[model samples]
Target chain A: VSSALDKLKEFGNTLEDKARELISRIKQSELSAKMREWFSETFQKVKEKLK
Target chain B: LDKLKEFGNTLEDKARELISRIKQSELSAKMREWFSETFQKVKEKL
Candidate 1:
């Protein structure tokens, strides 16, 4: 019996390469902007719900 | 076919937006660092 999935290494390596690329390219300011956009939408929606 | 093609374009836009705003701009360093570090930490804890 196979103890592992058929394609584990390829999967892990692909994720590793792309993730590293993201880290290397992005400035910290844009990262914060993207997260703030997500949270702000959620906060506005929730406030509408509460009121 | 036309409807499907339109939907496909929307999907492409969504995918692009996701990468541009989220994947590309966020979680990059964290993802790269965690991949190796988590494995090392797991081994140590075990």
Candidate 2:
């Protein structure tokens, strides 16, 4: 059970890192102009909730 | 067992809510498709 929990924690961290990377990629892409504000708002909420 | 189950449910619920919010957004079809592709792995894991 503890091992399972550890795995879950690791998975969550990985997902969070991926999320940050995704945001960065989105910001650098042309989509940034259209998605900048909305992505920031939505992702902030997701990060908080996931934590 | 119960605690783990609860935690798993909470995580899945949060993921679903996030996905729902993304789906409901006013982003164009192209942007939406991009997001869906980018988020596909996370969604599949949940």
Candidate 3:
């Protein structure tokens, strides 16, 4: 867990955030259907506890 | 990397799932059935 997590944490905080931000900017991304649903679900889940 | 990591996790999950599906070590048929199903499930997802 420790070893794998060391690598995974870096990628998630850096790579995924960059990719997600880029995908959000692209007017017509390849994952048009998936990207929107993914972000909305993610945002909802994150903000769920707040509300 | 979220997709890549998710895919990796999915693979790991399937491998673990296959191990769980094995009930009897002496029964090769059950193991093969599980192996087939596990790969099929992985193929359809991630």
Candidate 4:
């Protein structure tokens, strides 16, 4: 039980890495033009929510 | 499936809410910093 939250912290870091990888792939794919704007907006919302 | 993209989008929306809740605490701000850095990398990459 003591380490549970620590484990979740680790998972969050991993998830962020995976998400970045997806973003790179999206750039190479046809989805880039359509997604680039939406992705920026979505990510900005997340950052603002963090604050 | 095309819907998989929709699924990812939905997941991201929920993530924002959860992230906001976690971010409210000064406690975990350090932990969040790295996650934010990675997100910044993604933004720069895009």
Candidate topping lDDT: 4
Against the hidden reference, what TM-scores do the models get? 0.26, 0.32, 0.25, 0.37
lDDT of 1 by residue, B1-46 (tens): 3454455455445545544544343356567777989999999999
| 10 residues in a row with least lDDT, candidate 3 chain A | A1-10
Interface RMSD of each: 13.0, 15.0, 11.4, 4.7
User: How many Å off is the CA of A22 in candidate 1?
Assistant: 27
lDDT tens digits by residue: candidate 1, A1-51: 122321433444455555555444444545687899999999999999999
> What pairs collide in candidate 4?
none
Regions more than 4 Å wrong, model 3: A1-51, B23-46
Please compute and give the TM-score of the first chain of candidate 3 against the native first chain.
0.36
Candidate 2 lDDT by residue in tens digits, A1-51: 235544655665555555555555645664665588798899999999999
Whole-model lDDT per candidate? 0.57, 0.60, 0.58, 0.63
Give the poorly placed runs of model 1, Cα more than 4 Å off. A1-51, B27-46
lDDT tens string, model 3, B1-46?
Answer: 4565455455555544443444233266667888999999999996
Those runs of model 2 whose alpha carbons end farther than 4 Å from true positions after fitting are: A30-51, B1-46
Error of 2 at A48 (Å): 50
> What C-alpha lDDT, on a 0 to 100 scale, does residue B26 get in candidate 2?
27
Candidate of highest DockQ: 4
Rate residue A34 of model 4 by lDDT.
68
